[PDB]
Amino acid sequence: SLQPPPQQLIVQNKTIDLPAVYQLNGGEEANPHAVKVLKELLSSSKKGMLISIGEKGDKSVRKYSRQIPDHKEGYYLSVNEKEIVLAGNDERGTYYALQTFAQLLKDGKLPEVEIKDYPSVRYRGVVEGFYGTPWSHQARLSQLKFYGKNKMNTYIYGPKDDPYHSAPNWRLPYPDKEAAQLQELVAVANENEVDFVWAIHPGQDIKWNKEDRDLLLAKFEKMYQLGVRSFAVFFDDISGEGTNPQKQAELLNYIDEKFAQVKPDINQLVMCPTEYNKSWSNPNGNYLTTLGDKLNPSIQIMWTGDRVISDITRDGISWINERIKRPAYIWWNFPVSDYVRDHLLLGPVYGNDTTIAKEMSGFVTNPMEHAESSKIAIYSVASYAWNPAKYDTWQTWKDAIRTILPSAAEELECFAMHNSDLGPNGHGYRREESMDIQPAAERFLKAFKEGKNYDKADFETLQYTFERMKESADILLMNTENKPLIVEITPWVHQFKLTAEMGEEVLKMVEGRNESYFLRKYNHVKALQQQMFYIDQTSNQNPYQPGVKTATRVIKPLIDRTFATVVKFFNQKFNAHLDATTDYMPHKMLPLQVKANRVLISPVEIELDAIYPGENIQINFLSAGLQKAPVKFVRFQFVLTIEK
Ligand SMILES: NC1=N[C@@H]2[C@@H](O)[C@H](O)[C@@H](CO)O[C@@H]2S1
């Protein structure tokens, strides 16, 4: 597969060996970044096969000047028995030719091909713009290299929880250590043909005075000294005076006129509006029209679609584009998981109109705090933004996985296939999950509940799935090819294995040969539920959506409902009182929940499993601080906080 796929490809089924001896033409005139990649692949003389490299206008590629597409970042690539051609419309084009060339080379051999290629969307890449733990320095380094390989030309640095990015320390220069890291990032970005865009997020406490304006420009100047050549100002997720669009526009134009248009070498200048998606816009207010009218024409305006989280439609992007008077620079909120932090979002990229490239200036993905894990979606977004007309949702997902974890690709697909949906949430955004087994699941459960006979084949499909999930979990746990990825996903991988083991035991209950066997399967299931509760209380204990949820759309519900159904049938058959509940709750009481040190009833009496010091109660139909009073029972949202 070539990823992204080129705009035009012509293949011939001859192949050539890569030349043992060869003549490199244009080595000194061409993009040094592209020559460096080429020299690595060759690891030469006057005699032997000709390799021509260079940009349109160089002597090296004069013969090919009409084949080179007249598009920024375009290139012409050709392989035949006599010569190899690697010719960009511009320097970035040449690097990209090389990235394509690297994907052709296979066991020291190349296909005979001719490619003319270029991107459909001008700016393509990643905004590190989420809430939560910002990416590590090493993660960022890995990322920038990954962007070069996938022709992503943009990295927008904007972690909401970097205090030198947002309030109040947006006014302070980075300390020495962080500055030296940022400097290395910029350098690595430059080597991979990525624009490091430094963003600032000053709007929550900005004063519309000289003092704050000069501090902002002084901060941009410090970043410039660090090598930064592109800049952004974000006015998202704020209130008060900073949402004034006249002021915002004047500030951006001042930055443009006094800094961007005054330096020798500034590239992108981007802003994120306060009204950044249609549901947050006031159609009857002047906010977006004031930006579209006043903002200088080279300044980009970001947009996340019809909602905070949405996929981009033709109608949606028309609506914004008419108000801002330019093509929106898309901020796509997937695979960002900062509002469903107990889920991993490892499914394919899909839902964005593939015919609307002309209507967008840019397309950037906001990723998860899990940097390695995000590469599935990043790789896919790179493919989509480069060649949206040829974008293949599923093949690109598979290619991403095989790229990221070639030693355990099938295992990663298995894990990812069942870790895709968000579950219920306030943004209303959902993804498909476990689609291959969903119909067998649905039939199995329909039959079973009614007291009709299930299909054998559907029982086997479910069994095979659980088996494969265990194989995948254990193999991924031990994988040393991408350790950082394995560290990110490990808690989820544990929870995923438990889920599968639970499924297997629940299926053994359905089969349920005798009373003694059934009861042993039942007790095993209860212990696996407890184990899943332990992971959910000890791993990933963030303040917002703590814990670890996996296979939530189809698999866990199947297991749970099946478990509840067989327990009921057993109780009817044997007049028993086996507990039918599916999540472990050590307290007693509408299931209770445990979140960090809170004990909630799900929206008269709760008994805790020990005595605790009580902190407060917050009922809602409204609170009461309990001064560390010892507490086991409570009687009358409905949340008890304790010390634990
Ligand atoms: N421009 C936007 N700001 C927020 C981002 O920082 C968040 O990561 C995103 C997802 O919660 O929502 C909105 S989209």
From Swiss-Prot:
Changing D237N: 99% decrease in activity for pNP-O-GlcNAc. Its EC number is 3.2.1.169. Keywords: Glycosidase, Hydrolase, Signal. Pfam families: CBM32, Glyco_hydro_20b, Glyco_hydro_84_hel, NAGidase. Changing Y131F: 99% decrease in activity for pNP-O-GlcNAc. The active site is at D237 (proton donor). Residues 121-406 are annotated as: Catalytic domain. One of its GO terms (biological process) is carbohydrate metabolic process. It comes from the Bacteria. It is an enzyme of class 3 (hydrolase). The keyword Glycoprotein does not apply. Optimum pH is 6.0. A protein binds at G129, K160, D236, Y276, W331, W332, N333, D338, N366. Changing D236A: 99% decrease in activity for pNP-O-GlcNAc. Residues 122-389 form the GH84 domain. GO terms for molecular function: [protein]-3-O-(N-acetyl-D-glucosaminyl)-L-serine/L-threonine O-N-acetyl-alpha-D-glucosaminase activity; beta-N-acetylglucosaminidase activity; identical protein binding. Changing D236N: 99% decrease in activity for pNP-O-GlcNAc. Inhibited by 1,2-dideoxy-2'-methyl-alpha-D-glucopyranoso-[2,1-d]-delta 2'-thiazoline (NAG-thiazoline) and O-(2-acetamido-2-deoxy-D-glucopyranosylidene)amino-N-phenyl-carbamate (PUGNAc). Not inhibited by Streptozotocin. Metal-binding observed in X-ray crystal structures is artifactual. PANTHER family: O-GLCNACASE, PROTEIN O-GLCNACASE. Can hydrolyze the glycosidic link of O-GlcNAcylated proteins. Can use p-nitrophenyl-beta-GlcNAc and 4-methylumbelliferone-GlcNAc as substrates (in vitro). Homodimer. This is O-GlcNAcase BT_4395. It comes from Bacteroides thetaiotaomicron (strain ATCC 29148 / DSM 2079 / JCM 5827 / CCUG 10774 / NCTC 10582 / VPI-5482 / E50).
